[PDB]
Every structure is written in C-alpha cells, then in structure tokens.
Design a protein around this ligand. Structure first.
Ligand SMILES: Nc1ncnc2c1ncn2[C@@H]1O[C@H](COP(=O)(O)OP(=O)(O)O)[C@@H](O)[C@H]1O
Ligand SMILES: [Mg+2]
Ligand SMILES: [Mg+2]
Lengths: 14, 268
C-alpha cells in the first residue's frame, strides 16, 4: 500500500 | 564581511551537499532568520553559477506565499543566504499528523501553493522540486498561510521556451517528461501540484513502489487510481482537478492560472 514518506532530492540520474 | 559581525548562529534546521540551514539572530535588531550557509572553499565554476542563480531567483520572487530572502552575504570560504524564519514546520508533518485535509482545507492549501507557482512562472522561474517538505506553515495554528521554500533546484526560463534542463527533482513528484528525458518547462510544477493535492485529500501519494524503476514506469504511464475507502466521499470535481494536473502530456496539462479558476478552487 502507498505510504506518505520523506524523500531526498536528486541533482542527476540515480 | 557582515554576517559574522551582525548575526549569531543557533540550532540546525537541515543539511545539504556543501550547505547547512541554521536558525540565526541578527543581534542588535533582536530578529531571528533561517541562514543557508554554503561552504565556498574550492567550488567548481558550475557550483558558483548555481549559488548565484539561487540567490538571483530568491531576490526576484516577492509574494505572500513565497519565503523571502532578507540578505545575501559573501564572506571568505562561506556564503550566507538569509531568509525570513518560518516557524510552523513543513506541510509534510501537518498532513501526517492530521492524516488528511478536508476538501475545504485542501482547496485553501493548493490555492496558496498555485498562487506561489503562478508568480514563479510569470517571473520565468520553474521550481522542479515541489513537494510537502518544501512548503512551510507561517504558524502552528490550523489554517496558517503556506510558503514555497528551497529554490536550490529552481531554473530560469525565457518565456514559454523550454528544453532539456537536466534530471532534477524528487522521485515521487517527478513529471513524466523529466523521467523520459524530454524537453520540459513550467508544467513539471503543475504535475507536482497534482501529486501534492492527491496527498492532501487521502494522506498518501498517487505513485509509490519499493522499486524506483517501477515507480518511474507508473509515473510515465499516469497509472494512478482512486481506491476505496478514502476516495469514497471525495467530490468528482476534486478528482477532475487532480486529473487535469496529472496529465501525461505537458501541452494539455492545466496551468497555475487555469487551475486557480477551477470550480473546486474558485466557487469556494
Ligand atoms: N525559511 C525557512 N525557515 C525555516 N525552515 C526552513 C526555511 N527554509 C528551509 N527550511 C528548512 O530547512 C531544511 C532545508 O533542507 P532541504 O534542502 O529541503 O533538505 P532536507 O530537508 O533533507 O535537509 C528543511 O527542513 C526546511 O523545512
Ligand atoms: Mg531534499
Ligand atoms: Mg526542502
């Protein structure tokens, strides 16, 4: 099931 | 220069690649601010352009629902971007705490967010990193004003001229055109608004997978749905605005201006 979690930004492809 | 003389650092609010954000007090004024402290010892020409761009973009934007830059101070080995302190914490925390917003509270929230994004776009600024973690609350009293923050990934665009400006943003909020590595501009912000509004109404995101490749597949395909029970009571006009924001093709995606005139926002 989908959850609301904190997520870091990217500056290039990972 | 003049940060060491006038200002006093206190606790960390967050940390980045070669930067930290700390509460500071301009001593003689008795006024507190949030200071972004970038370490400038051996930065690339690129890294200098990005710092000057963030400073320039932040100086450009004067709006009730955008965090204001107070000052930009260049010292030996350290740069200080000094912003009005927002004390009510991240929109993210509030959603988790309340679980979700009522359509009235959600509408008032996304209205202020869209008025901020509209101003950005009119000034030729694309944020690229809209999400609940980058929206701050003016106070802890429910119904406080929201403020768009953190323009570290923001770009300058020349009118409606758009292009491939590189891969930047936050996985769950990334637009399909950025993941396809196609030309993009202002519409990537309205896709993020779509993700934020979905989160506001039922308290979880429209795109989630433990496997990032699969998350990106879902996003590129616009493979979201409105499951029971939390969508059972939601109005179709709320689902309509989300649908017009979560439109795969940026040409036909609703603009900030257009969204502000949607019955769900305006007749309200
Ligand atoms: N003007 C401000 N007032 C108060 N807190 C701020 C302000 N600007 C940014 N912040 C906070 O500082 C942090 C900025 O860090 P960010 O680049 O978003 O990465 P991370 O949140 O992972 O540390 C966040 O916690 C944000 O809420
Ligand atoms: Mg981040
Ligand atoms: Mg942030």
């Amino acid at each position: 099931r989908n959850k609301l979690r904190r997520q870091h930004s990217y500056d290039t492809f990972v | 220069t003049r940060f060491t003389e006038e200002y006093q650092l206190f606790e960390e609010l967050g940390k980045g690649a070669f930067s930290v954000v700390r509460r500071c007090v301009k001593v003689l004024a008795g006024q507190e601010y949030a200071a972004k402290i970038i370490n400038t010892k051996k930065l690339s020409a690129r890294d200098h352009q990005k710092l000057e761009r963030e400073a320039r973009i932040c100086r450009l934007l004067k709006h009730p629902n955008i965090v204001r830059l107070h000052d930009s101070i260049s010292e030996e080995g350290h740069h200080y971007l000094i912003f009005d302190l927002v004390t009510g914490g991240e929109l993210f925390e509030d959603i988790v705490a309340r679980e979700y917003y009522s359509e009235a509270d959600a509408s008032h929230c996304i209205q202020q967010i869209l008025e901020a994004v509209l101003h950005c776009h009119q000034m030729g600024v694309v944020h690229r990193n809209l999400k609940p973690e980058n929206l701050l609350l003016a106070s802890k009293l429910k119904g406080a004003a929201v403020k768009l923050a953190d323009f570290g990934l923001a770009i300058e665009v020349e009118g409606e001229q758009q292009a491939w400006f590189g891969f930047a943003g936050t996985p769950g909020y990334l637009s399909p055109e950025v993941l396809r590595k196609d030309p993009y501009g202002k519409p990537v912000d309205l896709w993020a608004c779509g993700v934020i509004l979905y989160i506001l109404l039922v308290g979880y995101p429209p795109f989630w997978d433990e496997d990032q490749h699969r998350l990106y597949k879902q996003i590129k395909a616009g493979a979201y749905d409105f499951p029971s029970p939390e969508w059972d009571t939601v109005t179709p006009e709320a689902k309509d605005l989300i649908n017009k924001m979560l439109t795969i093709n940026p040409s036909k995606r609703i603009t900030a201006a257009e969204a502000l005139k949607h019955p769900w926002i305006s007749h309200r």
